Symmetry: D5
Subunit: 145 residues, 10 copies
């Protein structure tokens, strides 16, 4: 249940009507916040999630609810971007996926974590390998303002 | 008859005068809107369409109209970015094409779908794969404003 | 007890050391979120709070907490910008205060409420009227991204 | 009915819980488009609507529906920003109101119309007089891109 | 005529049907070019024309053409901002009008001329004086790039 | 000649005193305008001409005059960006050259054409090929404003 | 002295050779840092010090050293922006002076303090008063990034 | 003269075609450098020159040259901005003038001087007093980069 | 210690529990300051530290402090970017690490040093070489402001 | 020397503390001007100098001075950027170097030259070839202002 606790169950998929090709979908998510930090102070991020579906696409409404479920969730065991990628992998079995998060600063320093994944043994694994090697080569200017 | 209905047949091509080279043509299209969402609310987006003509070039006034024709159309037999690319592939049989959407937020999230295509087994297919691999590698700051 | 419930009583003031002058203090607050909307979806906003202390100054760590305390609070007996100003007027009895919200879109529209206050019949009241008259005169480009 | 035709009737108000003070509310509306032009080509705008309520506030959902009702409305008799201001005056009887619209260019030129209003004989009329005299003194840079 | 020379004759007006109030119209014209310099080489500017009609509006196609008409016009004895103003004042007999030009560099120097006009002995004559006195108080950053 | 019509003969070169390196030269050209469009209305664009000379360099002043010459020219029996790249190939015989145009919108759509050329059978052709497969991968944001 | 602690005695003046005009001088100071916060962690700010001299001008190099001296100083038994304005009043006896600070965030909130001073009973006090009633009316957008 | 020293004698003027109104001319001058610093080391600014003409207007080429003449000029007993305003005052006997410099950092700090002048006893003197009061109320964010 | 001197000892690590994949972490540190210049005066930069942990993550409070520790530290015989890298390499034994500094102007010149590191004989050694070769291909605009 | 002529002799170098890795040093140089144009008239650029050192690193003050020395220097038979690269090549025997100029408009056009160099036969030469291929693929929007 999405309201008070983390709800990976709230995620819903639908058939990708274009298995025939590589359809690339990105979700800009700037209303992300959670109690993942070890300190209990909330954190705040814009999370960008990009993926190439195989059989399945994720419903955008369910994603929103899913991300809201993190709001008051301070049972952080494994790292939060990963939880997000894992859950979405479990859901769609995608060809490619990545979760990029840009955080508000805490202590004068903002953390931008990044993970991706492509199906083992396919060009999508080369894609993840390539998008890692090339990650964030050209950084937006940060002045804390 | 026209200004309401989806109208893939108002499109028009004309002959490419530089078939010897790869001429790159980008259409920036910030005035795009449709009912494609299942809900019934309309959507809004900047659509970027880049192609390399072979023999036939799409004429811009007709692309304007084609695009306006999505105003009141909203069917999901198929996805709208793909509908757009297909009608364009049908019309032109181009070396390379891509359709990139940047949409306004609903529920806090914005969706930026992207599909491309290149003539099978040609260098253009290699370009499609490559452009997909490097797609949106340096995303834009999206704060909802 | 605290991190869920609306908590106007965690606020704390301390004595102004420059009561002789008009000291202007602006708090930029981009990490704000609440359930104030009647629907139940949360809202997000940058809140700008500007005041001129009289005898009492609000201490920032407590304002941080006060503001976090709206996370799960969402009641509309009264509006949230006004709730915020009132608790602050209660706490400090300041010469001048204003609370300016810039919110994220829902249904395509974004709402930027603004209220101010100045001690009745003083120059500060004149400043309130004036600032309201010149409010947001040079708006910002809002394209939803 | 909002779907196919103009629906000023769709607008709904609720009691302003703060008649006691001047509460300033602004709506950034970038998903505006209509068939108001004399040519039948649609037009596209970001519309900023700001107001100070008296007895009444406008419901934001109804506004959105109201603005959508312009989408396919080519019965343009009187100018479109005015229609919008008038309808909203009829609805709320506000202390102050203004409608500012920034249009996409047509013919290499973009039109930014502006009207406002304050209750006759009050400081709000002086406010409108002042916000007119001062309108758009510092223009954002336009290069059509 | 406007095809290859200065063409006041192409300017056209229509009745302003929102005459019992102050309707502010800005035209952003970033496609302006002429041979106004005495050097015989063209110049380039964005031109901002803002006015408040009395009884008549400028028909904007006609203003597209009128401006176009300046393309191959070697300087009148007058200056081009003022001729633009005069011709518009003749056509319309407006309450208030201004014309502001931002030209591109020559010699490393860009020139921004500004003239206005409020109907003599009205409040708009006071506005003119006001907008003159406040002109460009907050100027854009020029790096020549 | 160089006042009212297309003048390729205005172009002029001078010896590249550095035939031993790849010297990469870029001209940014914001003041470009022509009558190329079929219709006969002007277009407007920033045109970017990057290139690597072999023995010859184009003398900047003549490129200015050359581009000026497009002002009253609309022989779109070829395409204008290709005509430009061509006359420059004819004048220079360069290792590498490209012509990227960014046009202002028309019918709400703005067109950005791009063509290049690297000396055949050399690494420059590899370059033209690569830069074409990488073209405009990280697009500028377009809203028409 | 001027290496590890507060050093007002580093400040230095020189005759204003223009006592006959109002010469308005602004120092932009981005490299400001101190231990002012109660807690003992550093703060960081761009500090803007604008002022109109009477007979004395502050010698820029000494202001650099003066501000440098805050690096290891946290005697918030006064406020640091006021200490700065004060030592400068003490050193200069200026017609007008202000000190606007913009600090990086802490606990997700960034503080911007502002104080000014105009010679009492003169027009400068009118100025201090006006600029204070107009302070930061057109705010910079804050997202923490 | 021009080439290698301070040269006020190089400024021309020409007749103001529009004495019956207030014609505002701004010059944006980003290529300014000199040896005015006490040190001997050069400085670099954008100087913004604005004025309303009475009967004489400054010749635009002379200004470029005049300004070039500061390139190796060191010190009089005056600040460089005032030297500029004085010279321009003598040349044209202007109704209003102002010189606004924005310089590049030295020692972590950039200096922004500003002077102006209205004809004594006129509304122009009221304008100058006004524009000094309103000066640089909304500064750009400075970060040194 | 970190209070007033260089403090590697404060750096702290923890087990990376997402070890069977590549997790990319960027720290934006825009509050960096030290006495690394041999001139004895401080310097100021944003520092971007990006790494891909093997088995251990840097604990980020400890990195806040470590960086803080540089505040009053007159240059090691080494250079400060590399010492930052080494110490982090010692603490963590990472697959990949880079440290990029953007310093503020001195002499009118800002220095951006960049070093990286991929574990010897792994793919990350190839990445290092790659990110080196591609470093800063698309550099930010420096106006010194 | 420095003061009034071209002075290569003014460049120092000092030992590279890090020969065992690739240490990338970028200089951002926005205060560059010279008389290199054929005309005799000056020019203004931001020059960006980047290099990987072998055994010598350039002394940062000498570079400022060296660069100042171009202030009144006219023409050799070389372009100015190459003169800079050559001088820096001689001084340090670098692994990689590149000079990127961005100049201000003359005649509606700004020129952006670029050269580089890797040690012949090394991976650095591969890097230089690579960086020329990838050069300025994503240009900033140029409008002359
Ligand atoms: Mg499958
Ligand atoms: Mg920033
Ligand atoms: Mg074929
Ligand atoms: Mg934003
Ligand atoms: Mg009291
Ligand atoms: Mg935007
Ligand atoms: Mg009432
Ligand atoms: Mg623009
Ligand atoms: Mg610019
Ligand atoms: Mg030809
Ligand atoms: Mg735009
Ligand atoms: Mg004191
Ligand atoms: Mg920001
Ligand atoms: Mg800047």
């Amino acid at each position: 249940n999405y309201l008070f606790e983390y709800a990976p169950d709230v995620l819903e998929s639908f058939p990708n009507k274009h298995v025939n090709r590589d359809y690339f979908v990105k979700f800009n998510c700037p209303e992300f916040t959670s109690l993942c930090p070890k300190t209990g102070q909330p954190d705040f991020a814009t999370i960008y999630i990009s993926y190439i579906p195989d059989e399945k696409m994720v419903e955008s409404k369910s994603l929103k609810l899913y991300l809201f479920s993190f709001r008051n969730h301070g049972d952080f065991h494994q790292d939060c971007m990963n939880i997000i990628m894992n859950d979405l992998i479990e859901l769609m079995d995608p060809r490619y996926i990545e979760v990029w998060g840009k955080f508000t600063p805490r202590g004068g320093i903002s953390i931008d974590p990044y993970t991706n994944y492509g199906k083992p043994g396919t060009k999508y694994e080369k894609m993840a390998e390539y998008r890692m090697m090339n990650h964030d080569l050209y950084p937006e200017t940060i002045d804390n303002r």
